[PDB]
Amino acid sequence: PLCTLRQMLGEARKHKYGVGAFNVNNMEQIQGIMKAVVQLKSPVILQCSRGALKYSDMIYLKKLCEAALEKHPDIPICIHLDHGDTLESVKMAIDLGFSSVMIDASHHPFDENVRITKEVVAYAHARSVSVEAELGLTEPQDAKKFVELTGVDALAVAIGTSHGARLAIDRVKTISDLTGIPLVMHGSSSVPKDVKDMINKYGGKMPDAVGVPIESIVHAIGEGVCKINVDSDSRMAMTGAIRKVFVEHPEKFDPRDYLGPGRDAITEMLIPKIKAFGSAGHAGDYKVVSLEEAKAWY
Amino acid sequence: PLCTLRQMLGEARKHKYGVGAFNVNNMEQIQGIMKAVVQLKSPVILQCSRGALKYSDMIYLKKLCEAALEKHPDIPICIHLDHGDTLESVKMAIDLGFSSVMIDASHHPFDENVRITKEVVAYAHARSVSVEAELGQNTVQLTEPQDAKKFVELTGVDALAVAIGTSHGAYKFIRLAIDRVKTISDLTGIPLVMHGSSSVPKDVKDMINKYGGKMPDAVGVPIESIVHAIGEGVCKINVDSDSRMAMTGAIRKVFVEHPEKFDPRDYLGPGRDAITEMLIPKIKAFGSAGHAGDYKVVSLEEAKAWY
Ligand SMILES: [Zn+2]
Numbered sequence A: 001p002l003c004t005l006r007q008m009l010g011e012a013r014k015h016k017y018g019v020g021a022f023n024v025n026n027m028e029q030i031q032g033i034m035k036a037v038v039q040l041k042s043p044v045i046l047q048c049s050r051g052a053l054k055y056s057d058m059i060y061l062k063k064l065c066e067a068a069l070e071k072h073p074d075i076p077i078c079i080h081l082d083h084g085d086t087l088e089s090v091k092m093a094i095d096l097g098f099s100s101v102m103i104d105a106s107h108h109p110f111d112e113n114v115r116i117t118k119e120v121v122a123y124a125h126a127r128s129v130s131v132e133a134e135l136g137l138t139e140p141q142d143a144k145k146f147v148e149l150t151g152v153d154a155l156a157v158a159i160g161t162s163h164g165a166r167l168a169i170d171r172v173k174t175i176s177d178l179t180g181i182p183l184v185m186h187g188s189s190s191v192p193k194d195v196k197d198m199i200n201k202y203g204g205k206m207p208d209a210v211g212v213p214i215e216s217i218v219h220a221i222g223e224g225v226c227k228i229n230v231d232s233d234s235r236m237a238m239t240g241a242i243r244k245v246f247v248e249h250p251e252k253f254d255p256r257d258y259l260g261p262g263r264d265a266i267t268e269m270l271i272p273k274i275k276a277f278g279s280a281g282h283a284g285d286y287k288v289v290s291l292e293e294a295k296a297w298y
Numbered sequence B: 001p002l003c004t005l006r007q008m009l010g011e012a013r014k015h016k017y018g019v020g021a022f023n024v025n026n027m028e029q030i031q032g033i034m035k036a037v038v039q040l041k042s043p044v045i046l047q048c049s050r051g052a053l054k055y056s057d058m059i060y061l062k063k064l065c066e067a068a069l070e071k072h073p074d075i076p077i078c079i080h081l082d083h084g085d086t087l088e089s090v091k092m093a094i095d096l097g098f099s100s101v102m103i104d105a106s107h108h109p110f111d112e113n114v115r116i117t118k119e120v121v122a123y124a125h126a127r128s129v130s131v132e133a134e135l136g137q138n139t140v141q142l143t144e145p146q147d148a149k150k151f152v153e154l155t156g157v158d159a160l161a162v163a164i165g166t167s168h169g170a171y172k173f174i175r176l177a178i179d180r181v182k183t184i185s186d187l188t189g190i191p192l193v194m195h196g197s198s199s200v201p202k203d204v205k206d207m208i209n210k211y212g213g214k215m216p217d218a219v220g221v222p223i224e225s226i227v228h229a230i231g232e233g234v235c236k237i238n239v240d241s242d243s244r245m246a247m248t249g250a251i252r253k254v255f256v257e258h259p260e261k262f263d264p265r266d267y268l269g270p271g272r273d274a275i276t277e278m279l280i281p282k283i284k285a286f287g288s289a290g291h292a293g294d295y296k297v298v299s300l301e302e303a304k305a306w307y
C-alpha cells in the first residue's frame, strides 16, 4: 500500500536497516524494480526527479506508480519527489498522489534553506506527506538545529558522496544521535563491475566509472542511514543490456527484445543491493498508515 | 475521450479517410503516437496485443492508456485489443476498459470463425464495445467478396479485416488488390481494416543498417497503395513494425554517436521522437488530420443502444 516515508524509514531506523530508493522514469524501470523488491519481500521507495516527471509529462509516471500500487498491494510502497526545488514543485508532485517529497534548498544559506524547507513542511504535513530536506560536509550541530527548526521527517546528509558514475561514517552516528531522525544517503550508486563491463564490452565508453562500495554503504546504515538513493546503477544496467542485444542480434528490432532484457538486468542488479541494505523480508512488518490518518501525526 | 471503433471508423468511411491504429507496449511509444495525432488533430486507435498486455502485466498498459485519455480530453481515442484469440481475451480486455476488440479466428474454417466471432460479438455489443474480425497474406489467394458479405451479415461485426495482398512483419515482399477492396466495402457496407500496413520507410530503414543493424531485405506497403485503398473503403490502417523500427534506429544511432551515454532517456527519448516524426507524414497521407474535432464521442453505456 501507499506508504509515507516517515513510517517506512522509521521502521528501518528501529530495526537498523536501510530501504533503497530507486529512481524511475518509464514502465520497464518500475517493473524491474518492483520485481526485485517483491522477490525479497522488501518495502520500497519509488522516486521521481523533476526531470523524470518532465520526461513522463507527469500523468504517465503518475499512472505507472498507481499500477505498481494496485499490482503489489501488500508491499509497502512510498512514491517520492526527489530534488524538488520549489514549493510549486512539491505541490505538483503531491497532486500526483506522492506520499513523500524532497525539498532541496541545500545550495542556499542555512536560514533561507530553513525557510524554504519550513514552507514545504507546512504544506506537506498538512496532508500526511513526508518531507526530506538536505544540508550541505554536514556539521552535526547545524543538522540538529536545522531539524529542530524545520521539522522534516528525514535528512539527507553530505558524507562525501556524489551523483553520476571512503566517506565520513564518523559524522553519521553523531548526526543520527543529535538529530534523532532517519538520515538519507544520496549519490549511493555503486557502479557494479558487471554493469560497467558489459556496457564497455558492447560499444560503450565509460572507462572511469566507479561508485560507493556496498560495504561503505552498510557501515553507514549501521550509524543511522535509512534511505539509500540509487539511480545511476539502474541506468547502466539497462543500457549495457540493450547494447548487448544490439551486437549479438543486430537483426532484432522489436523494443521488447532489448527493453525486456534491460528491465531484467535492473532486477538482477538490485537483488544483491536490497539484500545487503537489510530490508529483505520486512514488507509485512507493519500496517501502512494512510496519508489521511498520517495527518494526525502533525 | 474514450471512443468506439464503430463510431470512429463510421466517421472515416463517410468522409473517405482512414484512421490508423498503432500498436503500443509501453510509455514512450504511447507518447510518440500521441504527440503526432495531437499535432495533426487526428482521431487515433491505440492497439494492444495479448503480447503487449503480457509484456506490460496488463495493468501498466491499462494505466498508460488512461493517462493518454486524461491528458488529451478532446482527442477521440479508441483503446483496441489487437488479435484477441479467445472470448476470455476480450473479457480481460473489456475489463481493462478497452472500447474495441478484434477476435481473429481467421485461421479457422469459416463456420468456426463465424462461431468464435459470434460469441465475442454478443459479449462486446452487450456493453458497447466494438468488434473487428478477419476473413482471410501477400500474393494472397485473396478473400471472396460474397463471403465477406455473408460473414458480416452472420456476425454483425463493426469492422472487417480483409486479405488484399497485405502481410505482417518487416519482410512483406508490387501492388495490392484494391479492386477487391471496393466491391467488399460496397457489399458489406461496413468499415474495412488493413493489417500488415507498415511501409518500412527508407528513412527508418537506413538508420538501422547504418548503425549496427541487420535488416537488409526489408520492404513495406507503399503509402500510395494505402491512400488508394483508403479511397475505396478501407478505414483502419494497422501500423506496428514501423514504430518498432523507428525506435530501434534512433536508439542505435545515439549508441554509436555517443557511446558514453547511459541514461535511458537519452536514447528512448529520441526513439520516441523518431516515432512521432515517422507517423506525421503517414497520418496526413491517411487523410485523418484535422478530423479530431468533427463528431462528439458516444460512451460505451450509450453505445449499448446501437445493438
Ligand atoms: Zn540525489
Ligand SMILES: [Zn+2]
Residues within 6 Å of the ligand: B168, B195, B196, B238
Ligand atoms: Zn495484424
